[PDB]
């Protein structure tokens, strides 16, 4: 699209990137654990 | 094409967001499957 230079631009991307990271890192972790306990070793004991 | 200024910010975020989504969606899926086969419950799959 457009590859220009600007202290703002760089900062902008850094902001969005970080945000997307945290959000995902949250939904992910929760998921891993979600299925973790869900398995409950075959059936409930 | 178009070499003007307008609604750039909005477009910028939309670009970064989407990118972060795809990348993560890749590392995630691969992970889920990674441990999936790793378990090799009983016999190797």
UniProtKB/Swiss-Prot annotation, chains A, B:
Trk also stands for tropomyosin-related kinase since the first Trk was isolated as an oncogenic protein which was the result of a fusion between the tropomyosin gene TPM3 and NTRK1. Isoform TrkB is expressed in the central and peripheral nervous system. In the central nervous system (CNS), expression is observed in the cerebral cortex, hippocampus, thalamus, choroid plexus, granular layer of the cerebellum, brain stem, and spinal cord. In the peripheral nervous system, it is expressed in many cranial ganglia, the ophthalmic nerve, the vestibular system, multiple facial structures, the submaxillary glands, and dorsal root ganglia. Isoform TrkB-T1 is mainly expressed in the brain but also detected in other tissues including pancreas, kidney and heart. Belongs to the protein kinase superfamily. Tyr protein kinase family. Insulin receptor subfamily. It is found in: Cell membrane; Endosome membrane; Early endosome membrane; Cell projection, Axon. The chain crosses the membrane at residues 10-33. It is linked to Developmental and epileptic encephalopathy 58: A form of epileptic encephalopathy, a heterogeneous group of severe early-onset epilepsies characterized by refractory seizures, neurodevelopmental impairment, and poor prognosis. Development is normal prior to seizure onset, after which cognitive and motor delays become apparent. DEE58 is an autosomal dominant condition characterized by onset of refractory seizures in the first days or months of life. Obesity, hyperphagia, and developmental delay: A disorder characterized by early-onset obesity, hyperphagia, and severe developmental delay in motor function, speech, and language. Exists in a dynamic equilibrium between monomeric (low affinity) and dimeric (high affinity) structures. Interacts (phosphorylated upon activation by BDNF) with SHC1; mediates SHC1 phosphorylation and activation. Interacts (phosphorylated upon activation by BDNF) with PLCG1 and/or PLCG2; mediates PLCG1 phosphorylation and activation. Interacts with SH2B1 and SH2B2. Interacts with NGFR; may regulate the ligand specificity of the receptor. Interacts with SORCS2; this interaction is important for normal targeting to post-synaptic densities in response to high-frequency stimulation. Phosphorylated. Undergoes ligand-mediated autophosphorylation that is required for interaction with SHC1 and PLCG1 and other downstream effectors. Isoform TrkB-T-Shc is not phosphorylated. It comes from the Eukaryota. This is BDNF/NT-3 growth factors receptor. Residues 34-45 are annotated as: Interaction with MAPK8IP3/JIP3. The chain holds residues 422 to 466 of 822 of the full protein. Receptor tyrosine kinase involved in the development and the maturation of the central and the peripheral nervous systems through regulation of neuron survival, proliferation, migration, differentiation, and synapse formation and plasticity. Receptor for BDNF/brain-derived neurotrophic factor and NTF4/neurotrophin-4. Alternatively can also bind NTF3/neurotrophin-3 which is less efficient in activating the receptor but regulates neuron survival through NTRK2. Upon ligand-binding, undergoes homodimerization, autophosphorylation and activation.
């Amino acid at each position: 699209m457009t590859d220009k230079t600007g202290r703002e631009h760089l900062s902008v991307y850094a902001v969005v990137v970080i945000a997307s990271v945290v959000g995902f890192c949250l939904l992910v972790m929760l998921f891993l654990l979600k299925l973790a306990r869900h398995s409950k070793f075959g059936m409930k004991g």
